[PDB]
Short mmCIF file of C-alpha atoms and ligand atoms in Angstrom, two decimals:
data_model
loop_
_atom_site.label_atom_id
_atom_site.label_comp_id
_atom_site.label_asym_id
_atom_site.label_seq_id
_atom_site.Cartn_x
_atom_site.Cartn_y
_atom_site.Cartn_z
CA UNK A 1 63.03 104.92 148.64
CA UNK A 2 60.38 103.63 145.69
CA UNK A 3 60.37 99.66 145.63
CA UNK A 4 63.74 99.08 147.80
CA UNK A 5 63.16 96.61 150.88
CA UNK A 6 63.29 97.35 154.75
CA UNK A 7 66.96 97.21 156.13
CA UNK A 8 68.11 94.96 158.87
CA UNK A 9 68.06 96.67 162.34
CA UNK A 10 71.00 98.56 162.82
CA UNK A 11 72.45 97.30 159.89
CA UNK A 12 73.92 100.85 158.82
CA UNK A 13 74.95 102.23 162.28
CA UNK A 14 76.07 105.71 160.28
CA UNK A 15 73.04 106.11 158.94
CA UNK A 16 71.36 109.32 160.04
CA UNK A 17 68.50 111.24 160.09
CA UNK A 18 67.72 115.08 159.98
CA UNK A 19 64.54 116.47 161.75
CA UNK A 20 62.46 119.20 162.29
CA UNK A 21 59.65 119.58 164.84
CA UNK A 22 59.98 115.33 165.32
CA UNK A 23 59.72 115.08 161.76
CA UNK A 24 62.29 113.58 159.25
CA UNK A 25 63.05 115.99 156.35
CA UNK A 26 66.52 114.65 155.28
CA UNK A 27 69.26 111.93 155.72
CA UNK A 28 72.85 111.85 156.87
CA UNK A 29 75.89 110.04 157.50
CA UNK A 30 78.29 110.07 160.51
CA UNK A 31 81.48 110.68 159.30
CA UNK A 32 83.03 111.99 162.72
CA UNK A 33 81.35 111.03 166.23
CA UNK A 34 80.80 114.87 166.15
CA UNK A 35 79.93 115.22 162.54
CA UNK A 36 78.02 114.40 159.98
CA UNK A 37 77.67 114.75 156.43
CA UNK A 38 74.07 115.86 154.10
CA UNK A 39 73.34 117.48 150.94
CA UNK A 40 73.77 121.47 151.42
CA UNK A 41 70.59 121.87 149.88
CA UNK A 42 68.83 120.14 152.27
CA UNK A 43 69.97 122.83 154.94
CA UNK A 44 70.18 125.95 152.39
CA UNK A 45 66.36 127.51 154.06
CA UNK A 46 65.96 125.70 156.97
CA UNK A 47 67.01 127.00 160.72
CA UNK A 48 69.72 125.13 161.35
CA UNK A 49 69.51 126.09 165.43
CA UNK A 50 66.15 123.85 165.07
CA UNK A 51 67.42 120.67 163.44
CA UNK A 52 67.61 117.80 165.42
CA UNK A 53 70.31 114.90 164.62
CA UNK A 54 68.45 111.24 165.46
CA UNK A 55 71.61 108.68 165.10
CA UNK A 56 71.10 104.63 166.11
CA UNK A 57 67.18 105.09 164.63
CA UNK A 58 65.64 102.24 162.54
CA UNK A 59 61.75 102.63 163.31
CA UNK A 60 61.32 106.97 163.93
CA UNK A 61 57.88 106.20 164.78
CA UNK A 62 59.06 104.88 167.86
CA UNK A 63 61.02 105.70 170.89
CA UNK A 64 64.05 103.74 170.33
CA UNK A 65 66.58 103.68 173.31
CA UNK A 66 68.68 103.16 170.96
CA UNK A 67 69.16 106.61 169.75
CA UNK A 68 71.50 109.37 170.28
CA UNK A 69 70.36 112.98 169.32
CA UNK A 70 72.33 116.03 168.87
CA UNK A 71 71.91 119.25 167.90
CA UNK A 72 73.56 121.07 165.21
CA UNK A 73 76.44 124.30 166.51
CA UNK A 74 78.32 124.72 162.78
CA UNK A 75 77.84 123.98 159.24
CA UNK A 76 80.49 123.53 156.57
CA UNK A 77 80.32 124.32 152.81
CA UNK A 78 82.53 124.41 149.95
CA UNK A 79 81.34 126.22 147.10
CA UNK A 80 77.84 125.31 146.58
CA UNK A 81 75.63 126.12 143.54
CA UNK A 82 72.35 125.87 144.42
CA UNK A 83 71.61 127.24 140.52
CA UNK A 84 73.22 124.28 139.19
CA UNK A 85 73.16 121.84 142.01
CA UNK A 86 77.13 121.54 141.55
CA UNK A 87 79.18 120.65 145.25
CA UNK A 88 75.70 119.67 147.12
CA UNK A 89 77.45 118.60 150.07
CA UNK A 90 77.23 119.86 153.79
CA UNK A 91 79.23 118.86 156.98
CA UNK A 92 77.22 119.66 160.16
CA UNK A 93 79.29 119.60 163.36
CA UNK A 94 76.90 118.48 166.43
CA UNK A 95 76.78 119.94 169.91
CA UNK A 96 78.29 116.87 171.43
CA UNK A 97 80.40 113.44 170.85
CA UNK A 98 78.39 110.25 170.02
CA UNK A 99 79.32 107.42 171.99
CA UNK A 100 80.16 104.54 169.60
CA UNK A 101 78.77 101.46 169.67
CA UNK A 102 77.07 98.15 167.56
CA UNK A 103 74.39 100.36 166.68
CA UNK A 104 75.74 104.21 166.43
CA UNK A 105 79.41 103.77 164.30
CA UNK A 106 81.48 106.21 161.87
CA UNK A 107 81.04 105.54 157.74
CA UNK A 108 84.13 104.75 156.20
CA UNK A 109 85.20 107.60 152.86
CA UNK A 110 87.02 106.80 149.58
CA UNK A 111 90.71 107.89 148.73
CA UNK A 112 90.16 111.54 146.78
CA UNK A 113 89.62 111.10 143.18
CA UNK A 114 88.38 107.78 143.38
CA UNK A 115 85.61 107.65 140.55
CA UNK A 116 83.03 104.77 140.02
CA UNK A 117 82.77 103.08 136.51
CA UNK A 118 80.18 102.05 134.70
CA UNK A 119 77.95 99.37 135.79
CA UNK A 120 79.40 99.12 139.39
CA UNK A 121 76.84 98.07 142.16
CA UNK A 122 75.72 99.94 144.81
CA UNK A 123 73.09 100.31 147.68
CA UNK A 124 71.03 103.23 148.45
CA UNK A 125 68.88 103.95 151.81
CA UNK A 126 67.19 106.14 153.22
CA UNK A 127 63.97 107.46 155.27
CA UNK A 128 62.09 109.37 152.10
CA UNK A 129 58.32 107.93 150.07
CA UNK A 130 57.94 104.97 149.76
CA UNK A 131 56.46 105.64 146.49
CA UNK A 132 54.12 109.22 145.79
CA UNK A 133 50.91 108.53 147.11
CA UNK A 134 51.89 106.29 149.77
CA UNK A 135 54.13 108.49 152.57
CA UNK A 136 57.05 108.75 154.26
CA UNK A 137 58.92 105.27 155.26
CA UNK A 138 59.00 104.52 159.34
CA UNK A 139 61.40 101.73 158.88
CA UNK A 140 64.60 102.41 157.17
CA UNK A 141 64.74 101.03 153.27
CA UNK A 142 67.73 100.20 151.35
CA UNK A 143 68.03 99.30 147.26
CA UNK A 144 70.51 98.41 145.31
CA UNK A 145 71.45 100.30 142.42
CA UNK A 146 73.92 100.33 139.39
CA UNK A 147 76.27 103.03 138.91
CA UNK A 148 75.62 104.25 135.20
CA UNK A 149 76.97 107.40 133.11
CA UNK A 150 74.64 107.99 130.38
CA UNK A 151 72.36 110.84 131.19
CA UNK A 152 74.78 112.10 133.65
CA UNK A 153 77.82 114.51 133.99
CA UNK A 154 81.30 113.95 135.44
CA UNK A 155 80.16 116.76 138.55
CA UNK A 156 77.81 113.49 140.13
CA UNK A 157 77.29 110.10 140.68
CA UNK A 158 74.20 108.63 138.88
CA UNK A 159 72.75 105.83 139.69
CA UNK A 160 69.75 103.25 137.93
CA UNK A 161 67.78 100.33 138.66
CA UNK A 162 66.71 98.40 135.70
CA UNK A 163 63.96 96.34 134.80
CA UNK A 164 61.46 97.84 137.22
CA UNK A 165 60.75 101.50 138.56
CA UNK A 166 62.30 102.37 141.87
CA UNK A 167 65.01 104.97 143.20
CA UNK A 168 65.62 107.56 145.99
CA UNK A 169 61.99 110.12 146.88
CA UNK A 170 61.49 112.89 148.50
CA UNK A 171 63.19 112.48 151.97
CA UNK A 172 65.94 110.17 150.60
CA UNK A 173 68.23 113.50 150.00
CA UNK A 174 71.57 113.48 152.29
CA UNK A 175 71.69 110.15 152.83
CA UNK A 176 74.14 107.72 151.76
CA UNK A 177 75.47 106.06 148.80
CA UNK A 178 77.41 103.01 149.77
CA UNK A 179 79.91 100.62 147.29
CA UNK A 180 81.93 98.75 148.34
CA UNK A 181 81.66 99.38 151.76
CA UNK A 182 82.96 103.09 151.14
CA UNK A 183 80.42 106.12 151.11
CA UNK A 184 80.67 107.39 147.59
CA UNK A 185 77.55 109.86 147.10
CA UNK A 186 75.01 111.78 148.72
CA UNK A 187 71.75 111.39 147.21
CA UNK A 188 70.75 114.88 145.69
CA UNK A 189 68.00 115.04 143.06
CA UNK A 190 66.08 113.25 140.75
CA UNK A 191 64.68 113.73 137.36
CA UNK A 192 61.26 113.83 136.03
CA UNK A 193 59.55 112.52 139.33
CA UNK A 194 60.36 109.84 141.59
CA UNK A 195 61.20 106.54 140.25
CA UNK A 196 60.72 106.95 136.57
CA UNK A 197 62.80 104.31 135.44
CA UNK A 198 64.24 106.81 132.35
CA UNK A 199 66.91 109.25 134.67
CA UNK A 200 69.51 107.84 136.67
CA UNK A 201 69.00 109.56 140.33
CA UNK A 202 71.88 112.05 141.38
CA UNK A 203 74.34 111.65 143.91
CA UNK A 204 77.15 114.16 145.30
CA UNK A 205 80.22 112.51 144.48
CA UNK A 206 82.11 112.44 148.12
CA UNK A 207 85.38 111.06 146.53
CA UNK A 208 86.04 114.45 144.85
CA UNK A 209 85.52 115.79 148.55
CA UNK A 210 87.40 113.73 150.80
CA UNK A 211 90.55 116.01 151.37
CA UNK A 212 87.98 119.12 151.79
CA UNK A 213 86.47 116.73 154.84
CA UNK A 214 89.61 115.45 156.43
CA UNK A 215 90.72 119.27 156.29
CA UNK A 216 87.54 120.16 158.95
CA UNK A 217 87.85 117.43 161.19
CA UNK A 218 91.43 118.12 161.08
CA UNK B 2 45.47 122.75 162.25
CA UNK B 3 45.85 124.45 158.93
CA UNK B 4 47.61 127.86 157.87
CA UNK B 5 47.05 130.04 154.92
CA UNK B 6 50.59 130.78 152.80
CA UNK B 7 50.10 133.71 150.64
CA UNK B 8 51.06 134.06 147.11
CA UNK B 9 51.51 136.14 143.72
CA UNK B 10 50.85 135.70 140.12
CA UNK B 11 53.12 137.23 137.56
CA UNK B 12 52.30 136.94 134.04
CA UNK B 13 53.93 138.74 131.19
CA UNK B 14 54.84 141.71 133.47
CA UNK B 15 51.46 141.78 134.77
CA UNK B 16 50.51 140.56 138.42
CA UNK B 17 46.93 140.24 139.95
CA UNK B 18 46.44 143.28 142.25
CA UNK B 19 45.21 140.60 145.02
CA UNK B 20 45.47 139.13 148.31
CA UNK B 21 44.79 135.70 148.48
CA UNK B 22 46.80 132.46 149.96
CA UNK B 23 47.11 128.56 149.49
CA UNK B 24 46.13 126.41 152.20
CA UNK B 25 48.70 123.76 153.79
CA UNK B 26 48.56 121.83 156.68
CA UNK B 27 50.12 123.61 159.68
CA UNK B 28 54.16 121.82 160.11
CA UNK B 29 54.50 119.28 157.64
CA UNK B 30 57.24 117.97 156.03
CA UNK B 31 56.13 118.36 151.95
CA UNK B 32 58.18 117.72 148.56
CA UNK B 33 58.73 120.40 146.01
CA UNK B 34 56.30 118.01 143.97
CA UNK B 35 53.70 118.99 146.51
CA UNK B 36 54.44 122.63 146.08
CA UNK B 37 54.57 122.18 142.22
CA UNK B 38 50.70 120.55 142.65
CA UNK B 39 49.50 124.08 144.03
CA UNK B 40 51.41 126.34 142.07
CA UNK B 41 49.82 124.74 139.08
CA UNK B 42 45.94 124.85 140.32
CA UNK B 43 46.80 128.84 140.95
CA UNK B 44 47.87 129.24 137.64
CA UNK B 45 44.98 127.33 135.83
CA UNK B 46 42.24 128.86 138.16
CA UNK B 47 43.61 132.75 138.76
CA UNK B 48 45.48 132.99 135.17
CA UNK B 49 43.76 130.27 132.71
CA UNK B 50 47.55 128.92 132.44
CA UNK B 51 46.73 125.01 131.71
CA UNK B 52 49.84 122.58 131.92
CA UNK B 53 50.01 122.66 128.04
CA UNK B 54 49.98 126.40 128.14
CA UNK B 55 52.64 126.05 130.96
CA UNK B 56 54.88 123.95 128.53
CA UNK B 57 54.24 125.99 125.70
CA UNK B 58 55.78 129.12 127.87
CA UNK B 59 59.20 131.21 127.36
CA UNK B 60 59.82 130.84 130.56
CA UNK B 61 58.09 129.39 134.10
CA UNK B 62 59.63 129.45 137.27
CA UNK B 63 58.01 129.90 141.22
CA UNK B 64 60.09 131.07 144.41
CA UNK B 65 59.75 130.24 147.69
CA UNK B 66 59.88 132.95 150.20
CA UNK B 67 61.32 131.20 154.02
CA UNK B 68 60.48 133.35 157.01
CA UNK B 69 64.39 133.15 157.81
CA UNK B 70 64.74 135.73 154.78
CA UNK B 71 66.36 133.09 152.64
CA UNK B 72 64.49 131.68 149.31
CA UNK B 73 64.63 128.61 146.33
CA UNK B 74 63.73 129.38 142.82
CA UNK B 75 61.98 126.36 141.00
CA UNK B 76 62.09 125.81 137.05
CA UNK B 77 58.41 124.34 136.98
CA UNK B 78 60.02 123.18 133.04
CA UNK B 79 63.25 121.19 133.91
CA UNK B 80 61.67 118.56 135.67
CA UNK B 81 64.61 118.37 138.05
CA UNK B 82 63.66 118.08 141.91
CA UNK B 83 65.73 117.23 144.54
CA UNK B 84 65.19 114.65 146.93
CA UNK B 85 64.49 116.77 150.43
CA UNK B 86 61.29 117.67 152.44
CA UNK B 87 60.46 121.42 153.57
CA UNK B 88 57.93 122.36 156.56
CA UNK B 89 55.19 123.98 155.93
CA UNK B 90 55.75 126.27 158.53
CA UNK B 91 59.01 127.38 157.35
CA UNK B 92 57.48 129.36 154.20
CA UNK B 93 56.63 133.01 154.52
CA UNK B 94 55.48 133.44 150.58
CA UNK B 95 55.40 131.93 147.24
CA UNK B 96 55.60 133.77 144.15
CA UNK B 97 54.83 132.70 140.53
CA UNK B 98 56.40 134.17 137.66
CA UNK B 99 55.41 133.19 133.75
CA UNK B 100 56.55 134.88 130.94
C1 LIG C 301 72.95 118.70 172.34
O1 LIG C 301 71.59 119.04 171.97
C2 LIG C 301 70.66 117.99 172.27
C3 LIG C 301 69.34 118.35 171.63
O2 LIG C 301 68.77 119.51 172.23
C4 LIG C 301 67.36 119.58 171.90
O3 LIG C 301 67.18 119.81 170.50
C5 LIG C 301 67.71 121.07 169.99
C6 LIG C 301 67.45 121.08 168.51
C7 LIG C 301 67.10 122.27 170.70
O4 LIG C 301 65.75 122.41 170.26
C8 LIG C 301 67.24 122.10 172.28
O5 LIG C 301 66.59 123.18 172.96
C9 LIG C 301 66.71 120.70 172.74
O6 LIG C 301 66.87 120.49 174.16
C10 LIG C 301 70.60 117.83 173.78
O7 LIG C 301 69.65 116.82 174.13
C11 LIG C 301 68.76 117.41 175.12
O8 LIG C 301 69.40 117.39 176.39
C12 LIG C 301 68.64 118.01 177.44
C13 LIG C 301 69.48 117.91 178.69
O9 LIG C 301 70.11 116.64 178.77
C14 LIG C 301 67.27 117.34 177.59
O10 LIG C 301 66.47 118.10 178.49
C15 LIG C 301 66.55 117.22 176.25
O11 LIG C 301 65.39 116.41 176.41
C16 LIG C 301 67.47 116.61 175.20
N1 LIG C 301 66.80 116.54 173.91
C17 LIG C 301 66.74 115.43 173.16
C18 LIG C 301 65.99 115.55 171.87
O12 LIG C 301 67.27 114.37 173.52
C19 LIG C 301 71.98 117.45 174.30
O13 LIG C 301 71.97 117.38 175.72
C20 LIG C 301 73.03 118.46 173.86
N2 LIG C 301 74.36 117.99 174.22
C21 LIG C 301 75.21 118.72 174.95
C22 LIG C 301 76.54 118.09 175.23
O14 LIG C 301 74.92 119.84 175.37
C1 LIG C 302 72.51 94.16 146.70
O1 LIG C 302 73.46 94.67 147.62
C2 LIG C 302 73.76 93.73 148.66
C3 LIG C 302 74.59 94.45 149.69
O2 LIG C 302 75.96 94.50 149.31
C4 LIG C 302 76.40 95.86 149.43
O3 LIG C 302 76.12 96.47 148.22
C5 LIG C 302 76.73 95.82 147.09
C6 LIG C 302 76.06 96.35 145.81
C7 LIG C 302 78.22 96.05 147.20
O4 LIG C 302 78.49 97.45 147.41
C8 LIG C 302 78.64 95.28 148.43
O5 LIG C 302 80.05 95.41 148.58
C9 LIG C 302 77.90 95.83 149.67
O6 LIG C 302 78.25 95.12 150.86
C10 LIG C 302 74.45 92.51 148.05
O7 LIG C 302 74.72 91.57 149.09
C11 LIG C 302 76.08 91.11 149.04
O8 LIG C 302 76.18 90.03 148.11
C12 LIG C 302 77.50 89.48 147.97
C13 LIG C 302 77.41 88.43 146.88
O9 LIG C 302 76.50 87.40 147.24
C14 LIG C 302 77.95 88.90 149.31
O10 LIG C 302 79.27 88.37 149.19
C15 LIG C 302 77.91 89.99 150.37
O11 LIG C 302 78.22 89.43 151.65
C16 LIG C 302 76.53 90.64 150.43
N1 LIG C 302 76.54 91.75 151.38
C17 LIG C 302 75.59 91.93 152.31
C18 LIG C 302 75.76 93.13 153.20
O12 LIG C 302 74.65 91.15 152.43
C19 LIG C 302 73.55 91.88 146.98
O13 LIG C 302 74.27 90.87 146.28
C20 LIG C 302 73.09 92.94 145.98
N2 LIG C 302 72.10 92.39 145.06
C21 LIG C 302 72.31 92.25 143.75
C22 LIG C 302 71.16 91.71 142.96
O14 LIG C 302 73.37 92.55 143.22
#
């Protein structure tokens, strides 16, 4: 996350992250207290047997007794197009059941078909840069952003923050887009670099999804 | 503490006839950015392919060979990149193809 701000501790209890040999790679959301929810491409080359699922983390440079970590046993996809980055969405199911509490908790989804209009606000977050040059975040950073459709298509969620340069970096994929309290993207890819102020960053859109992720937890 | 990935230069049909590798360090997490950085100095330095002459090209793309057998193929001209990190470890090859 390029010029967003460090969250509150625990103040997103579904917020996840994805690592690989103790190092973060991707974001998540717990959407099940045995699944969670990333972008497909973020799993598409990795082995999956080797990912490691860090839930209740704020600082990962730490050793947070806080944290509950699980291992992946199943991915789900529904048509993904890795040529096109079209239905970039995953659902890992862990190895285990989180126990919920104040700091580990299960995101709240959309109806399906719920679609965001123009100029709607939003906040982003997530583990990735903190701006090329300067490295991966320790601390979890959230931004708020503005839901915009120019330079975008109907198959995402695009997002913008105006007046200055900042947006999701390399890292930031998988995690959470949250308005309105609901998770309504998955951050996916952005557009001539990091943070260029011209290209709204692009989400997953989860609302067109929902029924697909209801259908696996059953 | 570092480990040599080893890649391939396609240009117009013709390749290079040559082992040689890029140097990473050994598991780290690295953006497609990254990747883009080297793929570009091997062009320039092995083929004389500057950035303009990379724009000016019919087509440009790299792939990235995982040792799990899968791969990613990268338009170095769309200037899309999604947001994820990949290990350095994780890569068996790379291979550049400019036409
Ligand atoms: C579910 O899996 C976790 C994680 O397992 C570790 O990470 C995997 C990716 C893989 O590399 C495993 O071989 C690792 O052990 C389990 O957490 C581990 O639990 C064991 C026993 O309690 C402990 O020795 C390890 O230190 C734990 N690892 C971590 C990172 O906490 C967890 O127990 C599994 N849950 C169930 C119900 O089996
Ligand atoms: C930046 O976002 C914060 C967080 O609010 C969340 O994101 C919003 C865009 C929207 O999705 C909210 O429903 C989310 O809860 C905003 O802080 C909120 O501000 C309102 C108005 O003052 C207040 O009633 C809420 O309690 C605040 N929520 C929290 C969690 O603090 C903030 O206003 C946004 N900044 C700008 C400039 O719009």
């Amino acid at each position: 996350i390029v010029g967003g701000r460090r969250a509150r501790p625990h103040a997103w209890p579904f917020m996840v992250s994805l690592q690989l040999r103790g190092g973060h790679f991707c974001g998540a959301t717990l959407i099940a207290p045995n699944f969670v929810m990333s972008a497909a491409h973020c799993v598409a080359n990795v082995n999956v047997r080797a990912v490691r699922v860090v839930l209740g983390a704020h600082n990962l440079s730490r050793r947070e007794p806080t944290r509950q970590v699980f291992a992946v046993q199943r991915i789900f996809e529904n048509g993904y197009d890795p040529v096109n980055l079209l239905n970039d969405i995953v659902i890992l199911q862990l190895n285990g059941s989180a126990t919920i509490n104040a700091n580990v908790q299960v995101a709240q989804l959309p109806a399906q078909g719920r679609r965001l209009g123009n100029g709607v606000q939003c906040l982003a977050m997530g583990w990735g840069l903190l701006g090329r040059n300067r490295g991966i975040a320790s601390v979890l950073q959230e931004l708020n952003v503005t839901v915009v459709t120019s330079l975008c298509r109907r198959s995402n969620v695009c997002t913008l923050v105006r007046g200055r340069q900042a947006g999701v970096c390399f890292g930031d994929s998988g995690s959470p887009l949250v308005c309105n309290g609901l998770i309504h993207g998955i951050a996916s890819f952005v557009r001539g670099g990091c943070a260029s102020g011209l290209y709204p960053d692009a989400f997953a859109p989860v609302a067109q999804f929902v029924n697909w992720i209801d259908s696996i937890i059953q | 503490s570092t480990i040599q990935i080893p890649y391939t230069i396609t240009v117009n049909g013709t390749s290079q006839n040559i082992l040689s590798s890029l140097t990473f360090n050994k598991n780290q997490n690295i953006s497609y950015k990254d990747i883009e950085n080297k793929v570009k100095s091997v062009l320039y330095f092995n083929r004389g392919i500057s950035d303009i002459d990379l724009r000016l090209s019919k087509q440009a793309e790299y792939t990235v060979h995982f040792k799990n057998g899968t791969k990613r193929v990268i338009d170095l001209k769309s200037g899309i990149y999604t947001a994820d990190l990949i290990n350095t470890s994780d890569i068996k090859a790379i291979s550049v193809n400019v036409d």
